Structures are given as C-alpha cells and as structure tokens.
Amino acid sequence: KKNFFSDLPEETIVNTLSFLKANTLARIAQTCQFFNRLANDKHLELHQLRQQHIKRELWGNLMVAARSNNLEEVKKILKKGIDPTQTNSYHLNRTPLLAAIEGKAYQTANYLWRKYTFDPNFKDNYGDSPISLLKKQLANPAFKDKEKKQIRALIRGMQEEKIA
Amino acid sequence: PSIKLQSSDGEIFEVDVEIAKQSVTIKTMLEDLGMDDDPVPLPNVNAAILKKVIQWCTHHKDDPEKRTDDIPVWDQEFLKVDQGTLFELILAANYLDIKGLLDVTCKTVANMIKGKTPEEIRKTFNIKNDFTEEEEAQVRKENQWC
Incomplete structure (x- = not known):
C-alpha cells in the first residue's frame, strides 16, 4: 500500500x-x-x-524574422544554435534564405548567404530555389529599381562566387 | 547437473545447473568456488520469490528498439501476481541478474503505465503528488504537444 x-x-x-x-x-x-x-x-x-519540437518552434520564428528583414532577430535565434541550412519535408524544404528573398529582405539574405553554406539551386517543396526566385523577382515589373539591383548582386554572388 | 540454493527464509531449493546458470549471479558464484552436495545461500531472495524464479528459469532453459507487446503468453500468465510480488521479481531479476526475467517484468510494469492519467498512474503505484498546482501546471504546459 x-x-x-x-x-x-x-x-x-x-x-x-x-x-x-x-x-x-x-x-x-x-x-x-x-x-x-x-x-x-x-x-x-x-x-x-x-528537442526537435523546441527546434521546430525556433525554425518557424527564424523563418518570419528572416522574411521580414529583421536581421537582429534572426541573429538572436541563430545564436541559440540553429542550423538554417538544414531543412526537410516538415519544413517544406524551404530555408530562411529563401524566406528573406521572398520578403524582399536583401540585407538579411546577404547576411545568411555570406555567413552560412547554402545550395542556391536547391528547390523547396513548391519547386523554388534562391536563384530561381531571385530571377523570377527580376523579371517582375512591380519591383523597384534599387531592389532589382540588390538582387543581381545576389544572383551573381550565388552563381559565380567560390564554394567550400 | 543438480545443485541447491538457500533463500533468506532458510529454505533449500535443489535445481538443475543448466536452469540455475541463467542467473549470471549464480553462474559467477559457481566459478568463484567448486563447480561440477552443499547448498549455496542467496541472502537477498525469500523462498516465495525464489520458487517463482526457479519456475521462470526452468521454462526458459532453452531459448536462443523496444516493443512492449511481445511478451510471450506463458510469461503474461506467470506475471499475473500482485504488485508486491511483481516488484520483488524485478529485484530478484536484478540481484540474480537474469536479463530475460528483467525485461518481461519491466515490460509488464510499462504496460501498467500505458494509457493512464497522471493521477491514475499515482493511484496504481501509490505515488504521492507533491507538486504544487503552479509547478504541476508548468510541466503540463511544458508537455503540450502529446
């Protein structure tokens, strides 16, 4: 008893x-x-x-911080030991790099591109890559002049710069 | 082939060696002195339990991720005992170091935990809830996702 x-x-x-x-x-x-x-x-x-749950909530937030060009927030989340290059089906094979790009967050995208190793041609589960999205962005009239410039710089970065 | 063990009760059990050697503990003891007569004491087992583990080991003398549903039918029937006995079998399984028995007994307790409410769990095992409502609600919320 x-x-x-x-x-x-x-x-x-x-x-x-x-x-x-x-x-x-x-x-x-x-x-x-x-x-x-x-x-x-x-x-x-x-x-x-x-852990994978805590990681998952953090990933979602990182996605939003990246997309909204909130670089300081992205840095906070990254400082909590998250790898933004690592994606999977649960996350629709998208990356915060692709998040930044779609959100016109070109400073944040430059940060992520330079600071980490990303496959710029890797398509997500909607069939989009950093390059392909940046390029489709460039062909789009509703995009301002300086935006379309920040972009070409990025396309050239991802296409021509060194790796490893 | 035969040897005899003595419980803490004082009572003596004579068993074939093959069976007994399924307790690694017993197996170790036989090396530490004459193998192959004279009884060997097992101070941490009473005769009621010992009798039981003798049954278990006999039935198993032959033989060869964690799933809880594959307990043979014979063992399920064998482990149809009160909770007192069940935990003494586990202790015996430990003391005597019989891995097979340790599994099924542990598995049996695990199935007792499956599909229960925290309070029902406590009611089954007499676990005193000491958590204050605040701190309990915290692990509750902390474990939202399941």
Missing part, C-alpha cells in the same frame, strides 16, 4: 521507462519531481522529441 518504485534502483526504473513512448513518459513525468527528472532522461524519447 506504498510506493512501488520507492525501493527500486534508478537504473531499472529507466529501463522500464525505456519501453514507453513520449506521450506516456510525459504523463508519468508529472506524477512527482522524482519521475519528472527520470522521464526526461537524456536517453529517452520525451527529452529527444522535445
């Missing part, structure tokens, strides 16, 4: 927890401080997936 794990070695409680998936670990993680520490074990799925 009292605590069952109370007299169990922590090693073997973890092993029992190793059979549980994140949803369940979450539930038992809130029975007490004891199980809170143990279910959030570095080696278990709750801690692991919670």
